[PDB]
Design a protein around this ligand. Structure first.
Ligand SMILES: CCCCCCCCCCCCCCCCCCCC(=O)O[C@H](COC(=O)CCCCCCCCCCCCCC)COP(=O)(O)OCCN
Ligand SMILES: COc1ccc(Cl)cc1C(=O)NCCc1ccc(S(=O)(=O)NC(=O)NC2CCCCC2)cc1
Ligand SMILES: Nc1ncnc2c1ncn2[C@@H]1O[C@H](COP(=O)(O)OP(=O)(O)OP(=O)(O)O)[C@@H](O)[C@H]1O
Length: 1193
C-alpha cells in the first residue's frame, strides 16, 4: 500500500513557501491600502499577486489546445473533400512542386489529424496538471494563514462566545476545498469564449448560412442547465436538513437499545421515525426530478439543434449538401458542446469562491489585534483601567506583586473575578491598559515564559490519554508512574482496553468530569519549569476525602519540592495552610496573610466562614471485481422495470441516434450534382428529418428511467433496514460499538440516495455510445474489426489495473484527511484552554508536517488520474489513425468515411469517462455492500403454539419463581454464565438483599433477558412455562430498570404511547411518588415536556422511571444506583413500599451496603445466589449469607 510514499517537495510548496508568499502579499495589501484606508473597501484585490506562480501558462496552453482541437474537424472535412474522383480527363505533371498539391491528398490530412490530436491532448493535460499542482499549494497557504491568525490571536476571545465552533464549522472543508477547485477550474471561465467564438467563426466559414440559425441554439441551451442548477441546490439543501433531523432522531432511538429491547417501547419509538424517513423521502423525490430533467437537457439539445439548421437548409435552395460539408459541421457541433457544462459549473463556483473569501476576510479581520497585545515575577501595574478584554471598567485600581511559592487563593463563589483576574495576571488577558511593570529580571511577553496551567473548563485530547498527558517532554516510567500512582486512575486503568494509550476524549472512550479534572491537574503535574498557575480547579470535581489526599500527593510532589505551587480554589475541604486570601469584589487583591494573620486584620470575613462552615490474500486477492455479486443484488431486487423497460429504452434511444446519423448520411449520400432540380430538395425529409423528433423524444424517457429506479430502491433499502433491525438479539447489540451501526445507517443511505444513480447513468451512456461507435467503425471497413481489436483489448488489461490501482490510493486518501481536520478541530475548540501553556508556537510544528503529508497523497491521486487520461487519449488516437487509414484505402463513398472518422473522433474522448465511471461505480457499490450484507438477516425467531392466555396484571403467588438449581454453563453466545448457582428466592420478600459480585450481574441480567442453556431445570414460575410464553406479546409485559436509570429522550411528554389515556400522570400517579412531583406537581413544563438526550440533565428529582405512574406492570426490578443521592434513594424506597402495597415483592441486585442496607425480608445465599430463605440478618451472618455484606456491617 505504501501509504506514506514521499514528500519529495516539502521545500517547494508545502509549508514554508506558502507562508513566504501569502504573508508578503498581505503586507503589500496593507501597505498599499494604507493610503486609501476606506475610500475603496476591497478585501483581497491583491490575491492576484499572491504567489508569483504564474497561471498565464495554463491559459496559453489551453488556448493552443482549443485551437488545435477545433481545427481537427476542418481536417476531417479536407479528408472527405477529395472523395469525388476527377481523373481520366486531366493528370497534371507538376514536377517537383511542393506546396501546389500537398493539401487535398487524403493521407497527409489524416497524418496531420493524428499529429494535431496527440499534441492537443498532451498540451491540455500537462497544462492543467501544472495548474492543479499550484492549486494544492494555494490551499495549503490559505490554511496556514487561517491557523496563524487563529492560534496566537484567538485565545482571549469574549465575542466568540456566540459561536464557539464557527471556524471549525466553516473553514474545515467548505472553504479551502471551494478555493482549490475554483483555482483548478478558473482557466475554463477565463478562456471558454476562446473556444465558443472560434467554433462559431469556423461554423460560419464552412457551414455557410443554413446552419447559424441551427447553431446559436446550443449557446442558449447551456443556460438551461445553468438555470436548473439553482433549483437542484435548493432541493439538496432541503434534503440535507431533513437528513439531519432523521440522523438526530435515529441517534436518540438507537441510544436506548438495551432499555427498549424488552420493555413496552420496543418498536413504537421508531414509528414516527419511520414516517420521518418517508417524509424525508418526499423531498428526495423532488430533487430527483430536476436531475432527471437535466439529463434530458444534456441528452437531446444537440440533435434538436442540428435539425434546426437542416430546416434552415430549406433557406439555402441548393440542390443538396456535399457529404464533405455537413459531416464536419456535425463534428464541430459535437466538439463545441463540451466546455458549456464547465461554464455552467463555473457559474456557481465563482459565487462559492467569492462568498468563501469574503467570509475568510471577515473572520480573519475580527478583533484579532488586541486579543494578543505584546525572582521570576511579572506584575506591577498602576492601571487607570484593566478591562476584562472587551469589557472595560472591570478591574480599576489594581496593583499587586505576588511573592512566589505561595498558596494564593481568593476563595469566593460570587463576584470573585477568579477567571478574569487569573487570565489578567499573566498577561494572557487584555488588561494591559495603563502602565504595567515587571520584576528586575526574568529569572517581551510580560514575564510569563515559566507559566503552567490546568483546565478550568475541562479539556481532553482526541487521542490516547497518555498522549494527552505527554506534554512535549521526556517520558520514563519512574516519575510519571509515581505521579500517576499518587492518585491512581484504577477504574481508568481497568476500563481502558490498552491502558492510557487506548482511546480517550472526544470521539473516543468517555471520561467523567471528576476524572477530567484529575487528568488536567495531573498533566499540570507532569510539567517542567513548574511555576504553576491555577484558577479554582477544585470547586466542582471535588475528590471526596481525596482532595486532601490529592493535596498531599501534590505536597510530596511539589510542596516538598522547589517549584512555586498555588491554587485559587474556593473549597474548604482543603483549607489547611490556606493562608493567602483576597476580598476583590470588583477590585484588586488588597489582602494577603498567613493562616491566622488574616484574623489579625480582624475582618468579618474569617469569623463568618465558620458559621457557614486477517490476511492480504483475503483482501487484495479478493479485491478484484469486488462488488459484482452485490451489484447484482442491488439492481435485481428493487428494480421496478430495472431492465425490462429502462434497458430496452436506453438501447432503443442510442440506436435511434445512430440511425439518425445514418439517415443524415443517406439524405446526402450521392445525390450532389446528379440532379440540381426542384423536387430533390425535400425527398429525404421523411427518411432523415422525420426521425429527428425521436432523438428529442426517446432519450427524454430514458432521462428519467434510471433515476426513477434508484429512487424506488432507496426507499426499499431504507425500509429493509428498519424491517431487519426493528428488534434484534441482545448479544450483537451489547457486543458491537454504536458508532459503526450509526455510520452504516447514515452514510450508506446518503450514498445510495445521492450518488449511485448518476454514476450508473453516466457509465451506461458511455459504454453504449462507445460500443455503438465501435460497431459503426467496424462496419465501414471490415479490416477495422480486426484493426480495432488488439490495442483496446490490451487496454482492457490496463483498465483492470486502474480498476484497482487508484482505488488503493483513494483508500489512502480515504483516511489521509481524517487527522489534519481534527487539528483545526482541537486548537479552536480550546479557544482559551490552550491560552498560555508555553507551547503556542510549537502548535505549528505538527500542522506544517501534516499539511504536506496529506497534500502529497492528494497530488499522487491527481497524477494517477492524469496518467489514466493520457493513456486513454493515446489509445483513442491510435484507433483514429487505424480507422481513418482503413476508410481512405477502401474508398467506398464519402458517407462511409465521414461516418467512420466522426465516430472515431467521438469515441476518442469516452474512454476516460468509461474508466472513471467504472471506478466510481465499483467504489460506491463496495461501500453499499458493507451494510447490504446485513440487509435483512434475522437472528431471533418466534415459532410457538402458545394458546391465547388472558393473564392480566394480577400477581398469582407473589411471583414465585425458583427455576434454577445448580445452573449449567450457559451458551448461545450472549455473555454466558460460566458457573453453577442454584436459585431459590423468597416469594413475599419486600426489601432488597445483599449479593455477591460473582453472580450479581448474572442475576440482574436474569430478571428478564432470554437465554437457552442457562439454569434450565425444575421450574415453578408465573403459572405459565418460562420458555412457552408467546413471543408476540409476553415479552411486552415485562419490566426492568437501567443500571443508572437514563431516559435520554422526553419519555414523559409522549409517555402515553401505549393504551393509557389515564389522564392521571399530572398529580395522581406521579406527584405522590414525590420524585416526579418536582417535574409534575410544582412545575410549569407540563404534561408535554422533553429533554434532549437527558436522563439526568433536567431530571434530577426522578432519575428512575416513576413506578407508581406506570401503575396508575406488576414486577419491579432494581439496579445499582451509581450516582443517586442517598436521601432521594430512601424516598424512592418509601415510594417502593407504596408500590409494594400493590406488589409486596421485590428483588434487587447489589454488592454494597448503600443499596442493600434496608433489608426487611432476605435470604441466606450461596456464593452469590440464594441458598435458603431466612429473615434474620444475624442468621445470615452466622451462615455464608451476609459476611461480605458484614464487611461493612
Ligand atoms: C500497405 C500498402 C498497401 C498498398 C496500397 C494498396 C491501395 C491501392 C493504392 C492506392 C490507390 O490509389 O488505389 C486506389 C484503389 O485501390 C484500392 O481500392 C485497393 C483496395 C485494397 C486492396 C487489398 C485507386 O484509386 P484512384 O486513384 O483510381 O481514384 C482516383 C481516380 N479518379
Ligand atoms: C481543466 O479541467 C477541466 C477542463 C475542462 C472541463 Cl469541461 C472540465 C475540467 C474539470 O473537470 N475540472 C477543472 C480542474 C480539474 C480538476 C480535476 C481533474 S481530474 O484529472 O478528473 N482529477 C480529479 O478529479 N481528482 C484528482 C484526485 C484527488 C483530488 C484532486 C485530483 C481535472 C481538471
Ligand atoms: N465568557 C464570559 N461571559 C460572560 N461574562 C464573563 C465571561 N468571562 C468572564 N466574565 C465575567 O467576569 C467576571 C468574573 O468571573 P469569575 O472569575 O468570578 O467567575 P468564576 O468564579 O470562575 O465562576 P465559577 O464560580 O462558576 O467558577 C464575572 O462577573 C463574569 O460576568
Amino acid at each position: 500500500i505504501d501509504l506514506k510514499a514521499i514528500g519529495k517537495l516539502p521545500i517547494a510548496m508545502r509549508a514554508v513557501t506558502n507562508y513566504v508568499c501569502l504573508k508578503e502579499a498581505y503586507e503589500e495589501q496593507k501597505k498599499k491600502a494604507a493610503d486609501h484606508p476606506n475610500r475603496t473597501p476591497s478585501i483581497w484585490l491583491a490575491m492576484y499577486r499572491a504567489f508569483g506562480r504564474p497561471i498565464l501558462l495554463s491559459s496559453t496552453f489551453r488556448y493552443l489546445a482549443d485551437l488545435l482541437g477545433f481545427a481537427g474537424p476542418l481536417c476531417i472535412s479536407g479528408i472527405v473533400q477529395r472523395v469525388n474522383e476527377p481523373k481520366n480527363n486531366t493528370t497534371r505533371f507538376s514536377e517537383t512542386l511542393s506546396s501546389k498539391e500537398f493539401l487535398e491528398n487524403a493521407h497527409v490530412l489524416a497524418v496531420l489529424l493524428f499529429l494535431a490530436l496527440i499534441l492537443q491532448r498532451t498540451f491540455l493535460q500537462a497544462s492543467y496538471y501544472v495548474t492543479i499542482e499550484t492549486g494544492i499549494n494555494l490551499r495549503g497557504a490559505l490554511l496556514a494563514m487561517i491557523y496563524n491568525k487563529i492560534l496566537r490571536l484567538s485565545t482571549s476571545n469574549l465575542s466568540m462566545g456566540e459561536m464557539t465552533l464557527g471556524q471549525i464549522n466553516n473553514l474545515v472543508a467548505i472553504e479551502t476545498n471551494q478555493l482549490m477547485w475554483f483555482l483548478f477550474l478558473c482557466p475554463n471561465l477565463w478562456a471558454m469564449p476562446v473556444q465558443i467564438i472560434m467554433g462559431v467563426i469556423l461554423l460560419y466559414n464552412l457551414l455557410g448560412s443554413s446552419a447559424l440559425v441551427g447553431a446559436a441554439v446550443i449557446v442558449l441551451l447551456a443556460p438551461i442547465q445553468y438555470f436548473i442548477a439553482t433549483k437542484l441546490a435548493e432541493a439538496q439543501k432541503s434534503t440535507l436538513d431533513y437528513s439531519t433531523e432523521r440522523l438526530k432522531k435515529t441517534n436518540e432511538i438507537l441510544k436506548g437499545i438495551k432499555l427498549l429491547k424488552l420493555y413496552a417501547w420496543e418498536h413504537i419509538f421508531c414509528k414516527s421515525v419511520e414516517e420521518t424517513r418517508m417524509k424525508e423521502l418526499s423531498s428526495l423525490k423532488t430533487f430527483a426530478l430536476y436531475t432527471s430533467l437535466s439529463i434530458f437537457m444534456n441528452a437531446a439539445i444537440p440533435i434538436a439543434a442540428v435539425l434546426a439548421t437542416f430546416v434552415t437548409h430549406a433557406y439555402a435552395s441548393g440542390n443538396n449538401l456535399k457529404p464533405a460539408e455537413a459531416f464536419a459541421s456535425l463534428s464541430l457541433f459535437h466538439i463545441l458542446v463540451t466546455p458549456l457544462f464547465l461554464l455552467s459549473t463555473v457559474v456557481r463556483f465563482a459565487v462559492k469562491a467569492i462568498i468563501s473569501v469574503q467570509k475568510l476576510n471577515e473572520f480573519l479581520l475580527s478583533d484579532e489585534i488586541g486579543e494578543d497585545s505584546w525572582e521570576d515575577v511579572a506584575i506591577k501595574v498602576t492601571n487607570g483601567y484593566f478591562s476584562w478584554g472587551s469589557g472595560l471598567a472591570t478591574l480599576s485600581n489594581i496593583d499587586i506583586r505576588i511573592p512566589t511559592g505561595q498558596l494564593t487563593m481568593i476563595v469566593g463563589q460570587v463576584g470573585c473575578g477568579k477567571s478574569s483576574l487569573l487570565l489578567a495576571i499573566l498577561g494572557e488577558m487584555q488588561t494591559l491598559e495603563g502602565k504595567v511593570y515587571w520584576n528586575n529580571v526574568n529569572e517581551r511577553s510580560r514575564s510569563r515564559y515559566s507559566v503552567a496551567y490546568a483546565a478550568q473548563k475541562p479539556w481532553l485530547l482526541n487521542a490516547t490519554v497518555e498522549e494527552n498527558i505527554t506534554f512535549g517532554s521526556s517520558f520514563n516510567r519512574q516519575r510519571y508512574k509515581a505521579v500517576t500512582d499518587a492518585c491512581s486512575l484504577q477504574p481508568d486503568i481497568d476500563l481502558l482496553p490498552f491502558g492510557d494509550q487506548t482511546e480517550i476524549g472526544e470521539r473516543g472512550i468517555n471520561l467523567s468530569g471528576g476524572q477530567r479534572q484529575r487528568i488536567c491537574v495531573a498533566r499540570a503535574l507532569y510539567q517542567n519549569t513548574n511555576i504553576v498557575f491555577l484558577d479554582d480547579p477544585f470547586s466542582a470535581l471535588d475528590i471526596h476525602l481525596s482532595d486532601h489526599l490529592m493535596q498531599e500527593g501534590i505536597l510530596k510532589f511539589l510542596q516538598d519540592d522547589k517549584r512555586t505551587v498555588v491554587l485559587v480554589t474556593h473549597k474548604l475541604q482543603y483549607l489547611t495552610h490556606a493562608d493567602w486570601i483576597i476580598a476583590m469584589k470588583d477590585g484588586s487583591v488588597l489582602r494577603e496573610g498567613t493562616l491566622k494573620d488574616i484574623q489579625t486584620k480582624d475582618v468579618e470575613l474569617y469569623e463568618h466562614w465558620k458559621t457557614l462552615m486477517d490476511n492480504m490474500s483475503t483482501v487484495m486477492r479478493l479485491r478484484t471485481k469486488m462488488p459484482w455479486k452485490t451489484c447484482w443484488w442491488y439492481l435485481t431486487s428493487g428494480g421496478f422495470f430495472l431492465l425490462f423497460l429502462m434497458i430496452f429504452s436506453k438501447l432503443l434511444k442510442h440506436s435511434v441516434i445512430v440511425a439518425i446519423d445514418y439517415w443524415l448520411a443517406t439524405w446526402t449520400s450521392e445525390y450532389s450534382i446528379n440532379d440540381p432540380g426542384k423536387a430533390d430538395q425535400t425527398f429525404y425529409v421523411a427518411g432523415f428529418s422525420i426521425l429527428c423528433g425521436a432523438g428529442i423524444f426517446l432519450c427524454l424517457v430514458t432521462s428519467l428511467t434510471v433515476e426513477w429506479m434508484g429512487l424506488t430502491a432507496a426507499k426499499n433499502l431504507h425500509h429493509n433496514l428498519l424491517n431487519k433491525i426493528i428488534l434484534g438479539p441482545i448479544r450483537f447489540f451489547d457486543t458491537t460499538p454504536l458508532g459503526l451501526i450509526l455510520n452504516r445507517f447514515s452514510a450508506d443511505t446518503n450514498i445510495i440516495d445521492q450518488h449511485i444513480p448518476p454514476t450508473l447513468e453516466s457509465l451506461t451512456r458511455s459504454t453504449l455510445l462507445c460500443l455503438s461507435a465501435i460497431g459503426m467503425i467496424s462496419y465501414a471497413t471490415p479490416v477495422f474489426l480486426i484493426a480495432l481489436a488488439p490495442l483496446g483489448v490490451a487496454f482492457y488489461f490496463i483498465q483492470k489495473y486502474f480498476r484497482v490501482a487508484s482505488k488503493d490510493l483513494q483508500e489512502l486518501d480515504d483516511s489521509t484527511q481524517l487527522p489534519l481536520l481534527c487539528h483545526f478541530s482541537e486548537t479552536a475548540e480550546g479557544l482559551t484552554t490552550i491560552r498560555a501553556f508555553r507551547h503556542e508556537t510549537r502548535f505549528k510544528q505538527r500542522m506544517l508536517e501534516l499539511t504536506d503529508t496529506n497534500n502529497i497523497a492528494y497530488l499522487f491521486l491527481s497524477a494517477a488520474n492524469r496518467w489514466l487520461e493520457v493513456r486513454t487519449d493515446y489509445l483513442g488516437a491510435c484507433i483514429v489513425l487505424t480507422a481513418s487509414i482503413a476508410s481512405i484505402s477502401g474508398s467506398s463513398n464519402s458517407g462511409l468515411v465521414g461516418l467512420g472518422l466522426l465516430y472515431a473522433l467521438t469515441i476518442t474522448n469516452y474512454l476516460n469517462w468509461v474508466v472513471r465511471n467504472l471506478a466510481d461505480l465499483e467504489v460506491q457499490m463496495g461501500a453499499v455492500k458493507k451494510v447490504n450484507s446485513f440487509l435483512t438477516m434475522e437472528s431471533e425467531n418466534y415459532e410457538g403454539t402458545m394458546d391465547p392466555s388472558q393473564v392480566p396484571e394480577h400477581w398469582p403467588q407473589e411471583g414465585e419463581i425458583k427455576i434454577h438449581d445448580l445452573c449449567v454453563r450457559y451458551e448461545n453466545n450472549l455473555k454466558p454464565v460460566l458457573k453453577h448457582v442454584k436459585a431459590y428466592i423468597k416469594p413475599g420478600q419486600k426489601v432488597g438483599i445483599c449479593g455477591r459480585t460473582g453472580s450479581g450481574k448474572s442475576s440482574l441480567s436474569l430478571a428478564f433477558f432470554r437465554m437457552v442453556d442457562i439454569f434450565d431445570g425444575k421450574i415453578v414460575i408465573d403459572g405459565i412455562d418460562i420458555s412457552k410464553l408467546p413471543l408476540h406479546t409476553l415479552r411486552s409485559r415485562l419490566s426492568i430498570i437501567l443500571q443508572d436509570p437514563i431516559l435520554f429522550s422526553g419519555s414523559i411528554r409522549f409517555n402515553l404511547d401505549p393504551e393509557c389515556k389515564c389522564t392521571d400522570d399530572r398529580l395522581w400517579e406521579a406527584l405522590e411518588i414525590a420524585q416526579l412531583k418536582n417535574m409534575v406537581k410544582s412545575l410549569p413544563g407540563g404534561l408535554d415536556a422533553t429533554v434532549t438526550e437527558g436522563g439526568e440533565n433536567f431530571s434530577v428529582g426522578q432519575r428512575q422511571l416513576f413506578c407508581l405512574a406506570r401503575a396508575f406492570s406488576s414486577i419491579l426490578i432494581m439496579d445499582e444506583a451509581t450516582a443517586s443521592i442517598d436521601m432521594a434513594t430512601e424516598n424512592i424506597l418509601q415510594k417502593v413500599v407504596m408500590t409494594a402495597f400493590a406488589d409486596r415483592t421485590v428483588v434487587t441486585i447489589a454488592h454494597r451496603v448503600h443499596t442493600i442496607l434496608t433489608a426487611d425480608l432476605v435470604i441466606v445465599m450461596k456464593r452469590g445466589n440464594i441458598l435458603e430463605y431466612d429473615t434474620p440478618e444475624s442468621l445470615l451472618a452466622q451462615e455464608d449469607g451476609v459476611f461480605a455484606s458484614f464487611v461493612r456491617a
